[PDB]
């Protein structure tokens, strides 16, 4: 079965160069083009450009000339993508996609100067047949977080929110609805996990 | 570059009527034409590849059809897993150019909103910090008004609202609104409360806490 698996989100300084890659696996790696997209929020997507692994060679979009460079690695079946002289235009969503038409999950590039803030995790307890509790997830730079309940156990009945920017950091909640039998009685937890800060975090929600 | 455009940004439609969703290229594109599906979390994947052939795996209400720079993406039987955004993308010639998409939005049965409120964490008042959450969870339609009192008088500096997509498996809208304030200025007051006002009801769906209480 065809996968493409790309690197976690990124974040960079003004002025570096990132490389992100693109790990194939359930096809012939060389016999396909391999494409490179981004959508940046607000504009739809932009064609970067293609690389045929077989031989390393590349058709760019003009507009991505000089700042992308594609190559792609045969031995381990793996494209990348160099990206150079970063600014922030250059934050957005980058995808990885053959012709054949099979898609990478996206990977989160952000370009700052600011610094990394991890986030600082509450329990939302509260103040029924079915219970709603929450977390909040507060104060963190730059996106992504993932939000989890107990593990990726708790699954239906979840509200994780978009986060909201301010001063330069981000805060979002997300909320669960579960039964009156399992909390208090059990432990129940939200898993949040924030990469760029190489940290992760699970809270009790324990009654007030 | 080759223009491509899409009729409409959003169309609107209810479970297991049909849709179609339409492309015009600036130039003839000779029937290369891709129709992408993008859902929310942002997953994309290839529904109809050459104008109207369907990848290995997509179900066949889903059909494409046109040609020239005129090119359709009809959808039968819409079902909830089919709320997200669709786009065309032309290659026939470089570079390769994408539309900008048409969410799909899925009409439904009119629901009021779960509401509820949550007082700041201990834990958070130490950090000398204090955020009152509130999720009005699960309502259709779209539009809500939530307004914060304290100590009962109107309340809105330090709100910040946020609202999910149109929910893939009921259809529903979800927002929280969180009103952030000093730990200083939480203890200075007794009463909060969470007020929304959606199509549902004229009285508004009211929750508070008092710190007295508990």
């Known amino acids: 079965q065809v996968h493409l698996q790309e690197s976690g989100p990124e974040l960079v300084r003004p002025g570096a160069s990132v490389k992100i890659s693109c790990k194939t696996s359930?096809?012939?790696?060389?016999?396909?083009?391999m494409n490179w997209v981004k959508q940046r929020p607000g504009q739809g997507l932009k064609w970067i450009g293609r690389?045929?692994?077989?031989?390393?060679?590349?058709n760019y979009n003009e507009k991505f000339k000089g700042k992308a460079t594609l190559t792609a690695d045969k031995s381990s079946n793996t494209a990348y993508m160099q990206l150079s002289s970063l600014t922030s235009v250059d934050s957005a969503v980058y995808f990885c996609?053959?012709?054949?038409?099979?898609w990478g999950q996206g990977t989160l590039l952000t370009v700052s100067a600011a610094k990394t803030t991890p986030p600082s995790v509450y329990p939302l307890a509260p103040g029924n047949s079915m219970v709603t509790l929450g977390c909040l997830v507060k104060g963190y730079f730059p996106e992504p977080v993932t939000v989890t309940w107990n593990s990726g156990s708790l699954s239906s009945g979840v509200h994780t929110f978009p986060a909201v920017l301010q001063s330069d950091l981000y805060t979002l909640s997300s909320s669960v609805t579960v039964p009156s039998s399992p909390r208090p009685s059990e432990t129940v937890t939200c898993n949040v996990a924030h990469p760029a800060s190489s940290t992760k975090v699970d809270k009790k929600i324990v009654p007030r | 570059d080759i223009q491509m455009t899409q009729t409409t940004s959003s169309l609107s439609a209810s479970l297991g009527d049909r849709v179609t969703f339409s492309c015009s290229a600036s130039?003839?594109?000779?029937?290369?034409l891709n129709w992408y599906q993008q859902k929310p979390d942002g997953t994309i994947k290839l529904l109809i590849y050459?104008?109207?052939s369907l990848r290995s795996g997509v179900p066949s209400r889903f059909s494409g059809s046109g040609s020239g720079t005129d090119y359709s993406l009809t959808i039968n039987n819409l079902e909830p897993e089919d709320i997200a955004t669709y786009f065309c993308?032309?290659?026939?010639?470089?570079?390769?150019?994408f539309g900008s998409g048409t969410k799909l939005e899925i009409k439904r049965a009119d629901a009021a909103p779960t509401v509820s409120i949550f007082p700041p964490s201990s834990e958070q008042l130490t950090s000398g910090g204090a955020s009152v959450v509130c999720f009005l969870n699960n309502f259709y339609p779209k539009d809500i008004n939530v307004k914060w009192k304290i100590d009962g008088s109107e309340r809105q500096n330090g709100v910040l609202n946020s609202w999910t997509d149109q929910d893939s498996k009921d259809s529903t809208y979800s927002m929280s609104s969180t009103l952030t304030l000093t730990k200083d200025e939480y203890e200075r007051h007794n009463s909060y409360t969470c007020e929304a006002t959606h199509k549902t009801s004229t009285s508004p769906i009211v929750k508070s806490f008092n710190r007295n209480e508990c």
């Open positions: 050459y104008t109207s």
């Open positions: 690389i045929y692994p077989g031989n390393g060679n590349t």
């Open positions: 996609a053959t012709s054949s038409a099979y």
């Open positions: 359930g096809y012939v790696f060389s016999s396909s083009w």
């Open positions: 130039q003839d594109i000779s029937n290369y």
């Open positions: 993308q032309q290659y026939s010639r470089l570079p390769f150019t």
